[PDB]
Write a protein that binds this ligand. Structure first.
Ligand SMILES: COc1ccc(NC(=O)[C@@H](C)Nc2nc(=O)c3cnn(C4CCCC4)c3[nH]2)cc1
Ligand SMILES: COc1ccc(NC(=O)[C@@H](C)Nc2nc(=O)c3cnn(C4CCCC4)c3[nH]2)cc1
Ligand SMILES: [Mg+2]
Ligand SMILES: [Mg+2]
Ligand SMILES: [Zn+2]
Ligand SMILES: [Zn+2]
Lengths: 322, 320
């Protein structure tokens, strides 16, 4: 099982990579390859043995949730990796920025519990109390990421000078905190503002672009081939129901899109695709045209397919009406 | 002792109150009085007994630092109390806002370790790593505040509907997080921006004002009579120097303004009074003119005194 075939290693570079075919060790090997392949091990003097141990801690710090598990972690990092090639991001970003994008992608959901921020806050959990209701999950993911890096045996940054560490740390924090969907509209507005006259030499412009990139990868499941993308919806709804169930037997509010009685696989995706994914990737296409064909296309197909599924679903519902 | 006298109860409403005369149990009694006096106990159905246990928990959660200790906590709240009367804040703010201001003031520095954010961040402390370098101390103060309020025996908000709690919690977090001096100019800029045409109806305007109010009380030591204020400068430097020593000892960056070899009592206060205190109180005076005579005058006087103490210091150094 261990040892990636050259076929796999080449497939790893595209958004068509079948993320379900592999097990922890294989995905870990793939992640390891990405760091070597992108020139990060080289340019940052990353002890290659430390790189593997680090990946092991990361994996150990992910929970067995239906959706927010290590495989999701792998999907986001693999999609980021695909973006780097598709958009030749190495022509626009320094290696440090590439390191930040990949590492934040891998760490962005560390120790996720399976219940979102709205639950944390409403249920006044320890995390919501610790972070004063401000992106409790994302703040936690960052903290865990750096508690891991604080451990010598897992410190892939041990050979980077202090100034570079601070720059990397700051960049990662910004990107991980940017994955909080509550800030989606805000961040999209900020990006579309800079978008009027984007400037690659403008640090603030690049910061927003990196935020949009990790955001894109985080919710990119529907960009993948239908057979690869569809099973994720079930995983998502499983986790969502696990929460709405709890919020119900606790008297806490319940979100409709998480309601076991109102949400279907299709209605869970149609809106998300039309008003979240497509708009975001469209803006990104204004910067990278190749994105439209490789990523906006599968999104359009997915949207149409789900709208058809919804009609069959509505038909069955009509037959259940009394 | 813990039974405040009529004289004490009346003096407690002015910024001239001598905070050094009382012991913790007496200060606790004073704080307790403030909640009854302001109508917070009535209007929020605070169980009087719970109010006492809570204050005891707050007190227990402050550390014995030379500056950031329970007495600092008391000064800020006592100054906020003074302000409510001086500016007639109950005419401008709801009882919920008064509650937010008073409770935030009391909890704003909970469990402060005696070393600022720069130290937490540079030493990569547990707190800095937990808060991702974002106002680690203030975030912590706020977390402890609600960890205490989470305990049923200390929950002074136990009889407040959920919607009220949320509005209060959000308010306190905003105010406690606003006490990070790294954000001083930023907050002053936003406030002054609103001040171009202040609107008591505008919630965003009122949020900034509350932020400025708590900020004023937090660094209001020099507004107090010279005899009350003077001792604080020594507590301030003691704490500051404890940090710079440690930083030197651990090979960490040292901030000149906290450096034991460069800071004198006069240089510590002059700039602070002239560029932080006065400008901030000047803007507030625009909304509350009575503040000029009660808080600015003491400031101008302290400024002039410390400026003189400086010329004397320089002449003494020069003489050698
Ligand atoms: C605007 O903030 C939002 C936060 C969560 C959602 N969730 C959805 O709309 C649900 C019903 N559908 C959905 N489809 C996806 O493929 C997908 C991928 N990620 N996510 C979620 C984004 C938050 C974490 C999981 C998805 N949600 C939608 C919007
Ligand atoms: C602009 O933000 C700043 C933050 C801290 C300082 N500190 C100082 O200037 C020191 C030397 N003097 C000073 N005098 C005071 O009466 C006073 C009261 N509080 N503080 C500090 C405010 C931050 C916490 C302690 C004071 N600092 C100066 C400026
Ligand atoms: Mg997340
Ligand atoms: Mg403080
Ligand atoms: Zn994620
Ligand atoms: Zn303070």
């Amino acid at each position: 099982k261990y040892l990636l075939s050259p076929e796999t290693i080449e497939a790893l570079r595209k958004p068509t990579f079948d993320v379900w075919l592999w097990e922890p060790n294989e995905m870990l090997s793939c992640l390891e390859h990405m760091y070597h392949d992108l020139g990060l091990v080289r340019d940052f003097s990353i002890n290659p043995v430390t790189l593997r141990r680090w990946l092991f801690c990361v994996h150990d710090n992910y929970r067995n949730n239906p959706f927010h598990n290590f495989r999701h972690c792998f999907c986001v990092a693999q999609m980021m990796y695909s973006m780097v090639w598709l958009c030749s991001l190495q022509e626009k970003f320094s290696q440090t920025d590439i390191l930040i994008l990949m590492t934040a992608a891998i760490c962005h959901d560390l120790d996720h519990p399976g219940y979102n921020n709205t639950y944390q806050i409403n249920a006044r959990t320890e995390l919501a109390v610790r972070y004063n209701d401000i992106s409790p999950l994302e703040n936690h993911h960052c903290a865990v990421a750096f508690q891991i890096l604080a451990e010598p045996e897992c410190n892939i940054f041990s050979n980077i000078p202090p100034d570079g560490f601070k720059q990397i740390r700051q960049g990662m924090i910004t990107l991980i905190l940017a994955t909080d969907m509550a800030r989606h509209a805000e961040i999209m507005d900020s990006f579309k503002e800079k978008m009027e006259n984007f400037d690659y030499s403008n640090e603030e412009h690049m910061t927003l672009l990196k935020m949009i990139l990790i955001k894109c990868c985080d919710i990119s499941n529907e960009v993948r081939p239908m057979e690869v993308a569809e099973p994720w919806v079930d995983c998502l709804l499983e986790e969502y129901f696990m929460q709405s169930d709890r919020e119900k037997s606790e008297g806490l509010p319940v979100a409709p899109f998480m309601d076991r009685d109102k949400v279907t696989k299709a209605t869970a995706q149609i809106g998300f695709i039309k008003f979240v994914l497509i708009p975001m990737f469209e803006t990104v296409t204004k910067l990278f045209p190749m994105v439209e064909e490789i990523m906006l296309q599968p999104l359009w197909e997915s949207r149409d397919r789900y709208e058809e599924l919804k009609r069959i679903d509505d038909a069955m519902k009509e037959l259940q009406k009394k």
